[PDB]
Amino acid sequence: NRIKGIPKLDDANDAGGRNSTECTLILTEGDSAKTLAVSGLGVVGRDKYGVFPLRGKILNVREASHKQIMENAEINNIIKIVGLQYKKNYEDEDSLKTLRYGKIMIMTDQDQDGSHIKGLLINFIHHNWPSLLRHRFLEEFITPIVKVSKNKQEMAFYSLPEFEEWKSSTPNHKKWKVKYYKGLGTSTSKEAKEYFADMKRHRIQFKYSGPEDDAAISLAFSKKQIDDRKEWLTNFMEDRRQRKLLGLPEDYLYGQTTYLTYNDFINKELILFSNSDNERSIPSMVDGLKPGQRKVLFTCFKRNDKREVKVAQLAGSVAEMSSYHHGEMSLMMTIINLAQNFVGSNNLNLLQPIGQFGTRLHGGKDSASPRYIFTMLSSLARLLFPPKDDHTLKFLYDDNQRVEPEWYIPIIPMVLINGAEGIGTGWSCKIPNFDVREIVNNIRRLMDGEEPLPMLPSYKNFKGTIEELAPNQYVISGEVAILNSTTIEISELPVRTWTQTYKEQVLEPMLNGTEKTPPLITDYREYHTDTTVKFVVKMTEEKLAEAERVGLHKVFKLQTSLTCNSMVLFDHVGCLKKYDTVLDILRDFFELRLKYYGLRKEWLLGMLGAESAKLNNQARFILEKIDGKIIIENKPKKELIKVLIQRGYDSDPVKAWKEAQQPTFNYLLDMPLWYLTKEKKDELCRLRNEKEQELDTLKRKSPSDLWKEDLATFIEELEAVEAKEKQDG
Amino acid sequence: NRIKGIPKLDDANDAGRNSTECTLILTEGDSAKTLAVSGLGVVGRDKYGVFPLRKILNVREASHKQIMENAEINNIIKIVGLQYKKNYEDEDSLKTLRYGKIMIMTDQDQDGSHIKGLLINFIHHNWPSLLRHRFLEEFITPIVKVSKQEMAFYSLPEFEEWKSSTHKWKVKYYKGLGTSTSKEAKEYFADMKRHRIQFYSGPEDDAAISLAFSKKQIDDRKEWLTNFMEDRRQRKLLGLPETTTYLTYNDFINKELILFSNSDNERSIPSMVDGLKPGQRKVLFTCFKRNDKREVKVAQLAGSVAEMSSYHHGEMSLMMTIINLAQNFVGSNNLNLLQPIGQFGTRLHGGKDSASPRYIFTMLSSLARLLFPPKDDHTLKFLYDDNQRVEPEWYIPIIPMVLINGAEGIGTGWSCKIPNFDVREIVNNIRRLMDGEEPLPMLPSYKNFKGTIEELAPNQYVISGEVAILNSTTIEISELPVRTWTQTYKEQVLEPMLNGTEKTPPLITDYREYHTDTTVKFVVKMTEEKLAEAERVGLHKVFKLQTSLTCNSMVLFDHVGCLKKYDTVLDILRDFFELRLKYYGLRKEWLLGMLGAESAKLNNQARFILEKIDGKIIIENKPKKELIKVLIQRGYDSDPVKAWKEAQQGPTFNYLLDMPLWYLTKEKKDELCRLRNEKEQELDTLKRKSPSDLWKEDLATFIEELEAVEAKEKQD
């Protein structure tokens, strides 16, 4: 019959019989993957194929208790289906016939999560029966990464570089249709049948090629090789930097390929899972943002909202425009955190916190619902990230959608303005806040060739002191003063100490005592606002005198230590880098930003010239038509084009320049009839001169002059915004 | 004097001899407390206390152990120094309370009203003599604010009245507390007289509070909602449009808390006009507005729905609404409005086996806008979420969609279950009603269902699968009853037959599976004796291939918004038919005005181009004011489409002068002249057509596409 007790298993009809070696067990990533396999199998495929969905996390055998392994239903279910014995050898075909299935095929998405399942399954087999790996047992199901369709013709590519080679070798490639099939669920049931009719082109086998494979699997999953994984990622990022500089493509694993070594899989596919956590948690040094923050900011820039919108509405826009797929709760926190402006949050919030966005009372947690709070860009956001730089950035693609860039390039190092914090896999980042004006001044000093002045951490509206005990080591202190004997006033808490947390953890125990400590204070009264702290504490005269001799800041927990020893950021090329000082961050930023002001000037020169040429033709066309040199009334379109060509009119110069970066007279004839009137004609003629003067002015300006203009514009708006903030408080 | 152990309380300084003048603000969570703290500042802490409510229990419907194990109520008692057994009928005991007033500060949504009512219920149950005095109050913010000059309104009709004067300044809605900034909170707390409302006026209030929260008054609340919906229905049919200082307890229950219970009904029971719940309508409205010509990711579309329709429910709920609108397996929609491009779930797992929204794609079906014609959108009533225009109250499709894809929902007092019916039968029955004939009876019909559906009695049906005897020991099951999923049948029926229960032996020897993603094939082996015994009992009964379906709870919202129980599906069809026919009259009336304005606009545009070509109009090097005067002197009209749209709610000649110089060329002039003739012919053709003729046109267009779409579906 069939095995009893596994209702989720589609048992192969020949499994557990004479032809068991010809049977293949398909392990799928969840029920949706199993449904795809069922659709392809049809009826003929049900004799030698079995499908079982992995509806849970495969355990890491290497680092799990024997009790968990013996009670794990998922691990045990695989044992029953394949007929595997916990302690056995499978080096002889005699011992290979006790298995109900001759092959195991893992069917997962071609994303990082799917690779994790593949590796964990590989680790489970390697750690219990490394004999099976020796022969052709473990295999994987693969779908083409990209499909191109045109005129009812379809082609498939199994590697992103292969698709790029096709586009480089195929003119009019933009006339086709592009779809990406890394996820299994993207494929239809009809497409599933097509895959299973050509299983040779959708099957890959895992090959054991030596002890290097055992080392690779050990490196990936052994609990003792944590530091080895750090060097594993370190070499990967440097190898990626070298590969890009040498023009070599990204490391591909699948070609138009039938075999994949275990070592190749670990070092080229499973590595991307760990590097993703670093790439998601550690900000970039160029703009101080993580990809999630960048997606929100990119969405805000693209929307160009002149009026505030609900956070829930903006969150929908980010999901729609930037392909954000990391979760609704994460998206909400990212938007809210970009707008917070309380002491210890951003020194310069890029989004406006219009409503209850959290305060210093609860460390930003006391925010209201996203359906009730509003936000929009700050008036400083587009001054910090100038629109003219967008044309020099590298915008990324999520499948077919153009999304946020690799990084933005602000006019001052934003990573030092609002700080940075993140925990990845092997590295961690912690950078404090610094004064906006001091950073602008140091950028100006570097432009003039002077040495940068030292910078201490600075938090906006913080009323306490920050002192440097030693390089990169600081102590942040609140404010306490003795009003009289028996009374002290606490008027400031240290940075990142929240009002509610201080009252609950410090002052309440001193008033009520605990099981191990008698009360220290007799009373305390609270006089806070939403943005200021005031505690008035009463004490016994003798106990206060003792506290002063010890030190009130120490006794009342008004001191916090801050160490700058883990300033780890992604550099402009995508490699994690440990910055020893904030001046090193500023210097690295300065070189890149100065270079991109040169890039902006080159682009502006070409674009302004094209705009001037376009306006030159437009002004001439209107004037010639009024003068009668060109007649368009009741004239054939073909005749009009010939006249325009004969008279030396140019095709759309802006269009020509854009294609030049890699005839059309519509820019002339699309002009409204309004432009024949005197006033509008004069406006067009004036605009022609202004564009020419604009190009001439730019030709006389160096990249540093443009940088100084942007800094001056930003500073003026900064003073206006900050002055208004004080008036409203 | 001092309260100990409640670290979340901001005790008032005078809470004490001045306890009568002390007000305790009870806030909805920490964010509400933050707003109150911001408005209080420093000087406000002398007479005001703030405590955050981090859920009030229903005292009537709860164990007294829980009524003493709930820390939140116990903390409230401790803060306001309340004693359970006390009357406090005079100031003799009112000084035994630590605060003079309890102020409830919540959002102005349904969730906030629930907190307000439950707190009121808490006082009413243990200190009924305390709600008599000026004790319980609520914090109120203006509903609408208009903004370098700013004004505020505490009444929606007052805001509408403001529109009569001059309506663009800038408008913002402040129902949620979090909408107000800290600066605005300070302004509120300065004029606290204008932001505070106080709640007893008779025995009617006691009934109101009792009605809302008594566990025995369930059926009274159902009649309470029934009267509300019927009163609303009559007011809407009559065309009716549906601040103070004090609010009675009875007024709060009957005018504010009523919205909470009907909200569950309004979200779960679909409308009879379009067969949709509000969440589904928001998705469909987003799809119509986007008008995607290419497939889009479900994750991307979900963001668009959140951005465009003010959808504020769960993300998981939104994903399921989109996916369910696209499913096309046996038991799901007979006509899916969205295309399931990818793994959207199948009959194997009842649609639960769908892939991640970032990998599956969708777009409108080619039938969606044939079913929901764009020309009808101008006759619908589109709703507003604060300042954003969103989906309408309902769409008006050309056939009753509620009978096509069925209806299912559970509300508060009512429930809905309607099966699917055949599209062609529904179209045919609609055609019969247009001709004056009686509709034919209709049985439930599910697309691609290979079984049988029989009516035992009115509204009583039996759905059966297919089983065939192959030999003395073998039977094959080629169809399961509608809504029986392959995995659920294998796990619940066939697995126990193979293994047996604890006290019952196995019934079958073996079964083999040969399903596809859309078809079912079980080959079951038994012994000869057990098969013969099964035959005598009845194979459909033995293998559970029959399911009962009763049309006894076909409850839908009518076009006026009142829940109505339909006895037969023909009653739904007749009610739909009358409304749809009326809206075809409404469409013709709108089209007559709009087509006429378009024709007038093109007449001026064609005349303007021809006169410019003929030299009757000169614009070269001419002042704008001189050109405008010539156009008026020659009788040209201001934008007629703008004028007609303005009529439905100096001169404008931009529609003439914005035209490109291309229109002076021969071909474009001929195209403009051809378009001028086409618009006139369109208006003339419409005048000779009745509303029923337009309906028949839409049905024919829909039927042609339905055959094409369904033929391709079979081809795969």
A109 and B177 within 8 Å at the Cβ level: the answer is no
Q: Name, in order, each residue with C-beta under 8 angstroms of B101's C-beta and a sequence gap of 6 or more.
A: B22, B23, B24, B134, B135, B136, B137
Q: Which residues does residue A141 pair with via DSSP β-bridges, in sequence order?
A: A203
CB B413 within 8 A of CB B222: yes
The residue among B356, B357, B361 whose CA lies nearest residue B340 is B361
Is B385 labelled a binding residue?
A: no
Query: To which H or E segment does residue B695 belong?
Result: helix B691-715
| Closest CA of chain B from A635, distance in Å | 5
Helix (H, G, I), strand (E, B) or coil at A561: strand
The residue among B118, B79, B83 whose CA lies nearest residue B101 is B79
Among A43, A369, A504, the residue with its CB nearest the CB of B178 is A369
CB A403 within 8 A of CB A298: yes
Count of helices and strands (H, E) across chain A? 26, 24
Instruction: Supply the angle between the helices A436-448 and A582-627 in degrees, to the nearest 10.
Output: 80
- CATH fold, domain A462-565, is Gyrase A; domain 2 (3.30.1360)
Report chain A's terminal Cα–Cα distance, integer Å.
79
CA distance A725 to A721: 6
What is the β-pairing status of strands B171-173 and B522-525?
Answer: unpaired
Chain interruptions in chain A, by residue before each (C–N > 2.5 Å): 256, 662
CB A529 within 8 A of CB B41: yes
CA distance B77 to B97: 10
A671 and B660 within 8 Å at the Cβ level: the answer is yes
CATH of domain A581-727: 1.10.268.10
Among A1, A8, A359, the residue with its CB nearest the CB of B509 is A1
Q: Which of A310, A400, A506 to mutate to test the interface with B (most CBs of B within 10 A)?
A: A310
Among A34, A39, A307, the residue with its CB nearest the CB of B516 is A39
CA distance A682 to B358: 53
Is A29 labelled a binding residue?
A: yes
Q: Report the half-sphere exposure of B279 (CA within 13 A, side-chain side).
A: 23
Number of other CB atoms surrounding residue B389 within 10 Å:
12
Alpha-carbon torsion B683, B688, B691, B692, what sign?
negative
Helix (H, G, I), strand (E, B) or coil at B235: helix
Contacts of B180 in chain A (CB under 8 A): 355-356
The residue among A206, A132, A341, A192 whose CA lies nearest residue B182 is A341
CATH of domain B449-552: 3.30.1360.40
How many residues belong to chain A? 729
Nearest CA in chain B to A371: B312
CB B96 within 8 A of CB B81: yes
Contacts of B473 in chain A (CB under 8 A): none
Instruction: Supply the angle between the helices B218-237 and B203-213 in degrees, to the nearest 10.
Output: 100
Residue type at B651 in one-letter notation: P
Instruction: Return the HEC string of B243-266.
Output: CCCECCHHHHHHHCCHHHHHHHHH
CB A154 within 8 A of CB A146: no
Contacts of A529 in chain B (CB under 8 A): 37-38, 41-42
CA distance B444 to A442: 78
B343 and A35 within 8 Å at the Cβ level: the answer is yes
The residue among B152, B49, B161 whose CA lies nearest residue B101 is B49
Nearest CA in chain A to B45: A527
CATH of domain A282-450+566-580: 3.90.199.10
Instruction: Return the HEC string of A456-479.
Output: CECCCCCCCEEEEEECCEEEEECE
| b/e A511-531 (16+ beta carbons within 10 angstroms → b) | beeeeeeeebbeebebbbbbb
CATH of domain B9-141+181-268: 3.40.50.670
| Closest CA of chain B from A301, distance in Å | 16
Largest CA distance in chain A: 104
Q: Which residues does residue A480 pair with via DSSP β-bridges, in sequence order?
A: A490
Q: Does CATH number 3.30.1490.30 belong to domain B142-180?
A: yes
CA distance B274 to B557: 10
CB B139 within 8 A of CB B104: yes
Contacts of A504 in chain B (CB under 8 A): 7
Nearest CA in chain A to B312: A371
Q: Name, in order, each residue with C-beta under 8 angstroms of A603's C-beta and a sequence gap of 6 or more.
A: A388, A391, A392
Instruction: Supply the angle between the helices B666-687 and A637-646 in degrees, to the nearest 10.
Output: 150
CB A18 within 8 A of CB A47: no
Among A192, A356, A634, the residue with its CB nearest the CB of B31 is A356
Out of B246, B359, B384, B514, pick the active-site residue. Answer: B359
What is the β-pairing status of strands A146-150 and A153-157?
Answer: antiparallel
CB A568 within 8 A of CB A576: yes
How many residues belong to chain B? 716
| Closest CA of chain B from A74, distance in Å | 18
Tokens 């955050």, located at residue? B52
The residue among A499, A498, A424, A494 whose CA lies nearest residue A457 is A494
Tokens 């959708």, located at residue? A202
Residue type at A552 in one-letter notation: L
Nearest CA in chain B to A665: B662
CATH of domain A9-143+188-281: 3.40.50.670
Among B345, B358, B514, the residue with its CB nearest the CB of A43 is B514
Q: Which residues does residue A377 pair with via DSSP β-bridges, in sequence order?
A: A351
CB A635 within 8 A of CB B665: yes
B517 and A38 within 8 Å at the Cβ level: the answer is yes
Alpha-carbon torsion A641, A643, A644, A646, what sign?
positive
What is the β-pairing status of strands B546-550 and B510-513?
Answer: unpaired
Q: Does CATH number 1.10.287.1080 belong to domain A144-187?
A: no
| Closest CA of chain A from B460, distance in Å | 34
CA distance A488 to A544: 9
Nearest CA in chain A to B715: A190
Total CB pairs under 8 A between chain A and B: 274
Burial of B280 (0-12, 13-18, 19+ CB in 10 A): buried
| Closest CA of chain B from A368, distance in Å | 5
State yes or no: is B359 an active-site residue: yes
What is the β-pairing status of strands B136-139 and A576-578?
Answer: unpaired
Backbone angles phi, psi at A62, to 5 degrees: -40, -35
Classify B568-715 by CATH class.
Answer: mainly alpha
Backbone angles phi, psi at B143, to 5 degrees: -70, -40
A368 and B303 within 8 Å at the Cβ level: the answer is no
B621 and A728 within 8 Å at the Cβ level: the answer is no
In chain B, % helix, strand, coil (3-state, to 5) comes to 45, 15, 40
Torsion-angle region of B668 (φ positive above 0: left; ψ -120 to 50: alpha; else: beta): alpha
Structure tokens at A265: 């899989």
| Closest CA of chain A from B640, distance in Å | 20
What method did the depositors use to determine the structure? X-ray
B13 and A633 within 8 Å at the Cβ level: the answer is no
| b/e B329-359 (16+ beta carbons within 10 angstroms → b) | bbbbbbbbbbbbbbbbbbbbbbbbbbbbbbb
Chain-centre distance for alpha carbon A259:
33
Structure tokens at A188: 């239809």
Cα→Cα distances B601→A604, A634, B610, B640, Å: 43, 21, 14, 6
| Closest CA of chain B from A31, distance in Å | 5
CB B77 within 8 A of CB B109: no
Among B303, B499, B517, the residue with its CB nearest the CB of A39 is B517
Q: Which of A673, A675, A682 to mutate to test the interface with B (most CBs of B within 10 A)?
A: A673
Structure tokens at B633: 């002197």
B358 and A323 within 8 Å at the Cβ level: the answer is yes
Number of other CB atoms surrounding residue A175 within 10 Å:
9
Number of other CB atoms surrounding residue B239 within 10 Å:
6
CA distance A357 to B34: 10
CB B351 within 8 A of CB B330: no
Q: Which residues does residue A261 pair with via DSSP β-bridges, in sequence order?
A: A207
A632 and B656 within 8 Å at the Cβ level: the answer is no
Q: Name, in order, each residue with C-beta under 8 angstroms of A340's C-beta and a sequence gap of 6 or more.
A: A346, A349, A353, A357, A358, A364
Q: Which residues does residue B564 pair with via DSSP β-bridges, in sequence order?
A: B556
Tokens 């709920």, located at residue? B317
Q: Which residues does residue B489 pair with via DSSP β-bridges, in sequence order?
A: none
Contacts of A668 in chain B (CB under 8 A): 661
CA distance B90 to B96: 11
Is B28 labelled a binding residue?
A: yes
CB A550 within 8 A of CB A480: no
Q: What is the DSSP string of B303-328?
A: HHHHHHS---S-HHHHHHHHHHHH--
Q: Which of A343, A360, A371 to mutate to test the interface with B (most CBs of B within 10 A)?
A: A371
A184 and B343 within 8 Å at the Cβ level: the answer is yes
CA distance B587 to B692: 11
CA distance A153 to A157: 14
CA distance B547 to B568: 20
B359 and A4 within 8 Å at the Cβ level: the answer is no
CB A333 within 8 A of CB A278: no
Structure tokens at A223: 């609990």
Structure's resolution in angstroms: 2.7
What is the β-pairing status of strands B101-105 and B136-139?
Answer: parallel
Contacts of A185 in chain B (CB under 8 A): 342-343, 354-356, 359-360
CA distance A305 to B544: 59
A669 and B667 within 8 Å at the Cβ level: the answer is no
CATH of domain B269-437+553-567: 3.90.199.10
Query: To which H or E segment does residue B522 belong?
Result: strand B522-525
Q: What is the DSSP string of A564-581?
A: -S--EEE-TTS-EEE-SS
Strand order in the sheet with B466-471: B466-471, B474-479, B522-525, B510-513
Among A8, A323, A366, the residue with its CB nearest the CB of B30 is A366
B41 and A529 within 8 Å at the Cβ level: the answer is yes
Structural domain spans, chain B: 9-141+181-268, 142-180, 269-437+553-567, 449-552, 568-715
Q: Which residues does residue B453 pair with via DSSP β-bridges, in sequence order?
A: B463
